[PDB]
Amino acid sequence: MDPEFTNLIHFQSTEGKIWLGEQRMLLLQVSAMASFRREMVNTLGIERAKGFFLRQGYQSGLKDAELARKLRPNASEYDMFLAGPQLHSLKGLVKVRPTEVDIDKESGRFYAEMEWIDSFEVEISQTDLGQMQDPVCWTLLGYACAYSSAFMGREIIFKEVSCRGCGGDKCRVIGKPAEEWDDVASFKQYFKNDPIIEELYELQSQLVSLRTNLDKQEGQYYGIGQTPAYQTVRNMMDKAAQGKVSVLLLGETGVGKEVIARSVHLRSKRAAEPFVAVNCAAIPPDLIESELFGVEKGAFTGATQSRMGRFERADKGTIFLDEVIELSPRAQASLLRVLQEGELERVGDNRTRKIDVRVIAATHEDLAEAVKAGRFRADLYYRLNVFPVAIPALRERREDIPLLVEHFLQRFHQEYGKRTLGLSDKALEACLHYSWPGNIRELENVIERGIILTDPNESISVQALFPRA
Amino acid sequence: DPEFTNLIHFQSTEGKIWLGEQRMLLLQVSAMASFRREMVNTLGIERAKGFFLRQGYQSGLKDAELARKLRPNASEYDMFLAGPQLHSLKGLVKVRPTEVDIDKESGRFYAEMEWIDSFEVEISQTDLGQMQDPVCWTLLGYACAYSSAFMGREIIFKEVSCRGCGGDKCRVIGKPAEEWDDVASFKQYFKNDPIIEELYELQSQLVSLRTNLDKQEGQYYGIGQTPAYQTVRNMMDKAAQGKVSVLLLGETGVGKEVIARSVHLRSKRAAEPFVAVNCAAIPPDLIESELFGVEKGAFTGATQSRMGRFERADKGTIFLDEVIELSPRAQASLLRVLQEGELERVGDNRTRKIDVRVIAATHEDLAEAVKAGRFRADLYYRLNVFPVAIPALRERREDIPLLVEHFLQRFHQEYGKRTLGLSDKALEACLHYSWPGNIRELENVIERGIILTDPNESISVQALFPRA
Amino acid sequence: MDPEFTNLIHFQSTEGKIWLGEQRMLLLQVSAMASFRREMVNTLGIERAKGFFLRQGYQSGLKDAELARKLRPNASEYDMFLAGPQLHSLKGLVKVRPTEVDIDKESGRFYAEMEWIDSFEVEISQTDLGQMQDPVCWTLLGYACAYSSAFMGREIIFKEVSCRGCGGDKCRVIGKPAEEWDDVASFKQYFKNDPIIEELYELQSQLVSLRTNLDKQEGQYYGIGQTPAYQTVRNMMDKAAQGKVSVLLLGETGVGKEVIARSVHLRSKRAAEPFVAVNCAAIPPDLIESELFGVEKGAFTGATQSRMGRFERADKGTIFLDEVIELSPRAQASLLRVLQEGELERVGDNRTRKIDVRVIAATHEDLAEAVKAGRFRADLYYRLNVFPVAIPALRERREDIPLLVEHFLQRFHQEYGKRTLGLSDKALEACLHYSWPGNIRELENVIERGIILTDPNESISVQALFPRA
């Protein structure tokens, strides 16, 4: 009580501004706040809106504590502390009736009990009422906690032992230091920010990525740039797409030649046509020939039913052949006939079948001396060497490594949350200085190990990948 | 200002501030800045924008009623200008109306105004980056509200430029909503959808989508204690206590494999491996090599030795669907495993004992299959010790609703979040059906009924088994 | 042992022929037969070799029974039946010891117990150091069953009760007519000659079809024959796909607009670039804008970490927008800016970045009258209506119904069932007389239900689909 601050609330109406000391002020309507709190509780629940108003009262109380300290710096301990309730009476929030006070800034002692008459929160509560079985003066309590804590330096927690919105006779509150309370953990959880919008964004992102994981075979790599070698590889595949040339993918294991062939097929004039990939190592050669070219029924090797070969399955399209060196010699002769005249014969069949099939082979072994050993035909090598396309390893793309890895982090982050919000410059330096035999598979694997292995820290360990053992 | 400066009566001793007949309060601008900051940080920008817009709109309605009750007639322009004069009086903004055209009787309205020293831009200063959209929200709401209450028509302003976006001046234009082209963007702010319900809904969707991951037991037959389901349940639970092999006689598509899984879970060996085997797989020489393995050597064409499926069920349980489709050597080896607890891999001389419970199943009548020599009598009598007949849905008339209800909840979450309706005519049509396919056909028709349902709250009667 | 047996094996050394009665014969080494059986068992199954040798012995026994009948023509029942095993002894295969016999060709009664001394099959078992777990005298048993059956006129079946190759003391066999046996199926299974090469081709085809799921599906039911309505839609789709013009797909639910947009992207110049489809049925408020255009972190919005929008995911590529009418007005404005100026900015983002994204919107509701009442902006409507493409309901393409279902049937023939491709024309005539309110999705669903309701019947039953209530 005892205001004596109306002389400092000077204001100039002509400019549309209100002042108090050096601080700007605003005059808001109470009915608007009533509808505001009504819709707030309707769209946020009660516990969440209570915590939000509590945090806002705490922030307003810290600001008013700074203001009161700027107003009368050398008043007195009690005279400075009373400015809080005096600010409540001045701003029209509540009328304060402190029935008991005990304060000593040096010893840390604190205790108070006060009555809040004509609280604006109980007045708006008459507009939005229902069960109202818990105290409603939330911003008042948060402002009280903030002002008392800023004045004492200790954590002070108030509790409205009685409130008019609960059917009680008078709003009465008690304030003691937090150490002298029984259960403060619930109150401290009331003070947490709990940003629901970020939780909603994370849930929507995880839900979209989890529902899109079906048919998730389009985004891969080979589409980032930033190194001259990749630019050469992409413009070279652009040149190969427009032409009818059979393409040979020279590279190393784990560089992703199959997705490269898929991109070359999509960039070609026959992108809508089927694309069939065949890993020659997966199929034993005795089955390799019959799978690549099919087989017709009959007494000659004839099974019960004719089966179309993979080349006819890719008619008007493209055939990819990984590890083409591992072909049976008769299959190599059939491939040479298909490549030079566009004709094939099913196994056990004498009649010919026309085809129009683009060919993209790939291999890691040095085919030039492989022909010298008799392991591969010379003519088929001559027909396949028309358009070599070298795909560099990451060791040839050292400066390109970081963009991939952070992208990989996102690819794992939504699967497991934004764990490891760091890069560990030592780990990045170790990644720049490594041969990487599995240039993209080993990278994805070690990044998976780094994501799973860094649970009790927000920064990736340098030992999580390339452990010293 | 004649003479509104005297309208702000306040008594400090009473702890109240008054304006006309309306109680009011005076807050700091920095506190409102932190208020808007935490508000936008907790909800979306549009949610907070709608909140502040509705707050300004309610304040404008109340202030229009107050100005109407203060000076009764006077003049039209003075009564309309009392709104912006109230804005200047409360410390919100300074108003500079550069153009006005008002006629309350005819309904004509147009106005262009400048908002100088808006407090909302002072709150925008706490956010170092410029906002991409105008920030004077409660100002716009109070403007539209006061203008609409003063005219009797709905009047809508729009901040064509704002200083919080980097503009030179806060400039607003106000004309009646019917004279606008696109008004829906303003009306979207008035819709108040509870964000917490969307959080619970998204968490429920993600939890339901990740709960469909790798669980083994969730299929059907809940606590619907129908006499037939209860008899079959007590039969399986009494069967689980022993090691006796159990034969599941029933109909195709009833899901005998999960029944065997439940029998294994109710058994004493639930922690031990449970392996199901469909005999529809080709049974030439591969059925024997897969069921009992094969050892490497020159005595058989095996480069690598391969463990059989029965050894994978060691100390556990093996399910055998369509047991009639076994080769006679496989029937003999199964009889040896069932009567002596021993087996030997193909091409292997040494023998190893095993402890494997057996759950066979078949749709064909096994008695007449043993007749004509298609199946050995020994294995038949060893497997028929504890038959468990699974009734068709035709005799399960009372279990049909509970099932479909669970299936509804099971499939409404499947990429659709749709209706829970049943349409009693469709339900009576469903209870009166032979169901040649028991559970598979019912789940298929339930999905087909889900196909032709818009998020209208009712499954169509004609969506199931249409006239043609 | 008989006057006619010795010296009956006429043979000419210089002429290169060996004869026995009227039958040509061959003399092979035992070690060669041992390596023969070794290669046979090492390449095929134990049962495959068992059935081959048993059938070979059966044919030899049938021919030798006819030979013994024509050699001594007068009956002497026991003498001819014992001449059978005596013929076994003459060829050097086995020594026979009939310990019990009971024969009456007229009454059909038969029983015999015999011992096989020095069987060559056990000597071949000696080359396989591991003892067989089952009796090894296969061709002997087949010759026995064949000779006894031809001599009696009834089917006679022997079984080796004990064998020296399985570790037994003596080779002991019992022969009685098949009707007098208890379990005969295990022996009868050896007469079935199922080609192993067909099983190899079938297993390779199944494994390849299951391993081809790693590749993205080549497409869906978009490719059908040149039906005039489908052909008009096809040529319109091709001329629209060549350009960057945004395409609006007006149609009905279940018509499959997404596969249409995917085919448009594959036929476009940006097929290698990402294609992202977005259904607006997902919850809209503030989430539709943040997902379509992203959001940047900062104090201006409740974003802890920035999230890329789906339009940025479609950079240089194509985005599909199903139910575009269900866009928030802010989303419609941002989409209009992206479509008219090629630029967008993330929510809460200060800097603007341009994008190059083709747009394919689609809707079942009529956009006309939707712009009325304000549900959709006129600017975006006129910008999207430049190239409408109406997709007819299946009622106008009933001539396409068989082509679809046939492709669907074989597509479902691989679905864990290896079931049927039949149609039953009455069911097709019942299908043509139906509105199909759900066009293609409902037809695929009823086809799956019919596959569930039909086992070996090849034509799906006419009554299997849509039975009466």
Place this chain on the structure above:
Amino acid sequence: FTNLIHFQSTEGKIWLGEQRMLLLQVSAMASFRREMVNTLGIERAKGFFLRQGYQSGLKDAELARKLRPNASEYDMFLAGPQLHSLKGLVKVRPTEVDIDKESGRFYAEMEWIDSFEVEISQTDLGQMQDPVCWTLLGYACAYSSAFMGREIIFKEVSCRGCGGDKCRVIGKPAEEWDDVASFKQYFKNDPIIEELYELQSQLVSLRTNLDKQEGQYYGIGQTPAYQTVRNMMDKAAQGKVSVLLLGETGVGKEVIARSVHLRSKRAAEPFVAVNCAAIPPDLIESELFGVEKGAFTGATQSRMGRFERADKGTIFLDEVIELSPRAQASLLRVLQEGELERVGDNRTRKIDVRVIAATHEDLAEAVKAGRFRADLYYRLNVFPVAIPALRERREDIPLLVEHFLQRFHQEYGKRTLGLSDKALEACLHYSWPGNIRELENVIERGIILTDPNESISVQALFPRA
């Protein structure tokens, strides 16, 4: 010679020197080849009969060398074709012969009259536009190679089964031929049964992996630590006591709780696991106990909690320390009185839920900081169960890794047949901060980095060393 094929019919045997012989019918061989081609094709049966004739020819070459040790250089080679004529296979007419054992030179051309293979071909006919005398050709090649010591290859330049007038064959050393790769490919064993077993195994594993996994981490024995942990979980399984799993990150506590649930008396009842760290606490409270509709907390529709979803069953709670204090009080009420209330609801609901909490942080001092309730800690610490790290189970490590390698070998269908004991020593000598999880990860990376039949390198895992 015919004088050496003496035999005694009384014992049922035919002899030639010290080698036993047998007399087989030709009609049986005709049906044999018919069924062989019907179930194997033509090229496969051709290679089979070729190598079988090769084996018979090598055996007959050893026999002929045993018959006349001092046979002349010409007569010893001629013993082959006369053995062909003696056994009834073919009549031989050598039109040219040239042999020199020392220099390795060889050449011959001969006629095969009345071949039995063309005779059976007359019964089983069709295309047969390629030479049919397969076993004869293999026997000739084997005998000439065994006699010379060099690779000698014959080829039937003409055959009566191809419509030709006479069967004519030529034998030359393999180096002097143009295309020998086809014949050498004909000589390969080609075990089709092994390919069938491999395809069936890969197909069965590929069809069962789509049916979802159950668990794997448990069941690896032969170490004291695992045996103590398993007997502890066995003793804990029969009771209803709430269990606290104290361990380390990545030790696989969830599968341990699932095995304890299956070993318990409520194995048929539902089992629900919840990782508290994955769910933000603001959602943790509403998710563990549900929420009721009303003006309170929002909620357009009531939502069941995970505890009611696990009624009559068991709930696992990883990282129980990260619970909101009101959720901790509700969990203590559920634990000591078996009752719960949905958020925003006043009425109580009975439940019967077994509880297994787990944590990696030191729970004892976490209560001292005010981060966790004391009463709930006393109620959860009733039965602590420590799960050791792999460093305490080093002797068990190789068994795990071999099972791991097998589960990954089948992951790609055909992979390295080695472990490299040096790499095993490196695995035993590592802290493994991520037990079983880091082991699976390093093994997958090492397997992807190796592709031959060679042992996996120690640098494939723990590189840069």
